[PDB]
Design a protein around this ligand. Structure first.
Ligand SMILES: *[C@@H]1O[C@H](CO)[C@@H](O)[C@H](O)[C@H]1NC(C)=O
Ligand SMILES: *[C@@H]1O[C@H](CO)[C@@H](O)[C@H](O)[C@H]1NC(C)=O
Lengths: 421, 420
């Protein structure tokens, strides 16, 4: 049934910037049409919380929390998967083909998201901090592209971690599925090389002050415990039951533990481990992350995480605006290296969702704002971008509370950006 | 999983079986409580949400699978209007509400002249017959019909877009395809349409003339009957389409005379508890020229025999002669024979009031749905089903507002409960 439900949608499985400088003109468009469960719920004024979306090979997959309408049988975990079909005017139309709801006893307050090979993968936990280490387990959730299939799984798995990791911090994490293997990246904590790396970092703050070497509480885990990079591997082989291998490695200093996405890379058995910016002081990060046997995290852009002149550590480059929320880091599925970040900007007469597309090799950055008829200030912003007909498309979902209203509004739509002279 | 048909059948027949499951009189007044369920993951509902106009949406519901066909007017030679097909499930949402989720859809280009298309669903498949002109000739552009088949998911051998020349009985002359719901059973899609034939005409001219020989009806001065305008009465035509891939597609057309047909603008066909049979219903017409329900054979024998809503003058049958529009007589998918019809009533707010007739107990329930909007209607279409032993109806209507210039389309699910 797997290969039959795979032969059916291959029919449905069918450069952005300017090559030179000068004046840059950016034209944007919002495409509102969508056959998605999430957008239908948003139209009926239902409240969607923390929608994480992953797009890969023409298949899309969302996970989010639904706030019900006087119903408790207090939030509901929902998974959604479908296609990106070509609508009239060659517009990308997201059509849901399968979805699934969890009851509250599977406790899925925090869930990851990944799509690929007509499958949706998600790791769910009630508390964000998982101990490694009464054994703390993770809820593995897999959903097929269509109907009820052996592809579907709802199991509680005990992770197989390296000795010795202590914790991981699961918040908002996009992974991806390739070679029938789902991979995520999360902030981790381990005993190995902990004092050595704080020692190398402290020997780095003897030559240059950073807003971290006096910090008594580092980001993901309270106290002065340095976070590492954790790699969550989940095979989708049916030969044996599901097991979650967790690896760890030190890389650039992690200053944001509230998000760590992972995008596929043109290099085989490698990927882009990205960390979003926060508070206006923590820069975003892009790292080369290995997904094979050896797990190595090495920076791609060398100016937001340069290596220290002495030792095996990196420099925690930080900063001592009218952007309220900003997230996340999306590496575009292009052969040329480009990444995107969207901000909720209030510097103009109207509020705007302003996209920044960085080409860091040539040190150029394009920008385009999407002006909002509504006004208010957001608590969440999430982008997932893809290329469609030589154009940059982004699925954006943001959640904001209005200045004049009492309730919190959720917004979700597709946007396109073109860049010319 | 060697064949996609049975693999794409093992996955959703578990989900089409999710739908599993009218009191005994009442002392005094009988209370009916209604509800509108607006949530839907349907392409048609999404298009309506962006104020795009959907025209002539025919919907068929069967075994937990739904299927729509309609015309979409976009905003980008003749018109242009776009034929759209849609098929999906009725999944159980929170609070056990019926949620229509599209699982596959398809759009036709304009070299397929598909202005008029029938609709039928069953066995995880959507079947449709398409023509530009409603009148198809079967005589001597040699009239073919566009067979359109759509699978439950993705691109499958179930999908077909072929233009077939119908194989009719000798000799039928015409059929009139407008708004016709059929259904798919035993890998056969069946529709019923008004037909025209040479044979055995004298029997019904004699019964027809003998009906007004005691009482005048606005029918015995008629020198021209409706669908084909000629001086010969239309008959009942049965369009049979096998969906087996064992043989290439062939459109079998049979015909039989039954109760006198006075309305050629619609003829729907619902499944019946009787083996190899179904319920052929004909919609009402303005005034009180009402619709009729007949038992129609679906096997080797094609017989159309009146069930309700036709009287007998001499000892054939004839139909009975503030509601602005009304079409579509729907037989409920129950073991007991019950049928539904909803009207656009303006006697009150405006309302869509459903009438559910249970003739065995000689009882009829009614319920109005008051409209927040006001205006005058151009189209009304209902398709009803049972969900948790409750009466649900998918309704789509098209009306022109007092305040606008263009016509607005509305589509939603309604439920009706009856209590004491
Ligand atoms: C993770 O550990 C398990 C158990 O040894 C193994 O099956 C799996 O291959 C490991 N993953 C990697 C990437 O080494
Ligand atoms: C359809 O027509 C062909 C030839 O007239 C015949 O072999 C077949 O039995 C017919 N089937 C039905 C259901 O009418």
């Amino acid at each position: 049934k797997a290969i039959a439900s795979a032969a059916n949608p291959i029919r449905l499985s069918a450069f952005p910037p300017h090559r030179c400088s000068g004046a840059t003109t950016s034209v944007g468009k919002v495409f509102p049409l969508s056959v998605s469960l999430s957008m239908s719920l948003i139209s009926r004024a239902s409240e969607i919380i923390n929608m994480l979306t992953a797009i890969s090979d023409g298949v899309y997959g969302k996970t989010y929390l639904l706030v019900p309408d006087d119903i408790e049988r207090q939030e509901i975990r929902v998974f959604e998967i479908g296609f990106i079909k070509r609508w009239l005017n060659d517009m990308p139309l997201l059509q849901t083909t399968n979805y699934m709801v969890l009851p509250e006893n599977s406790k899925a307050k925090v869930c990851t998201i990944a799509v690929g090979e007509l499958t949706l993968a998600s790791l769910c936990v009630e508390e964000s901090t998982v101990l490694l280490d009464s054994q703390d387990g993770i809820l593995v959730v897999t959903l097929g592209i269509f109907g009820a299939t052996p592809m579907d799984h709802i199991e509680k798995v005990i992770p197989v971690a390296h000795p010795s990791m202590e914790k991981i911090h699961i918040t908002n994490h996009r992974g991806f599925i390739k070679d029938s293997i789902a991979t995520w990246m999360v902030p981790a904590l381990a005993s190995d090389k902990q004092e050595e790396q704080k020692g190398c970092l402290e020997s780095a703050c003897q030559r240059k002050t950073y807003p971290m070497c006096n910090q008594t509480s580092w980001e993901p885990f309270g106290g002065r415990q340095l976070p590492s990079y954790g790699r969550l591997t989940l095979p989708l082989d049916a030969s044996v039951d599901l097991q979650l291998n967790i690896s760890f490695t030190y890389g650039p200093v992690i200053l944001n533990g509230d998000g760590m996405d992972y995008y596929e890379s043109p290099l085989l058995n490698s990927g882009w481990l990205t960390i979003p910016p926060k508070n206006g002081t923590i820069f975003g990060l892009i790292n080369k992350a290995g997904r094979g046997d050896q797990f190595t995290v090495i920076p791609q852009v060398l100016t937001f995480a340069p290596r220290a002149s002495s030792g095996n550590c990196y420099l925690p480059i930080q900063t001592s605006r009218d952007v309220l929320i900003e997230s996340n880091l999306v590496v575009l599925p292009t052969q040329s290296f480009r990444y995107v970040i969207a901000t909720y900007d209030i510097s103009r007469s109207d509020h705007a969702i302003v996209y920044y597309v960085y080409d860091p090799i040539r040190t150029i950055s394009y920008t385009h704002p999407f002006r909002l008829t509504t006004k208010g200030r957001p608590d969440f912003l999430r982008i997932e971008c893809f290329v469609w007909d030589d154009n940059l498309w982004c699925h954006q979902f943001y959640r904001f509370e209005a200045n004049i209203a009492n309730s919190t509004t959720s917004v979700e739509n597709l946007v396109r950006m073109r860049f010319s002279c």
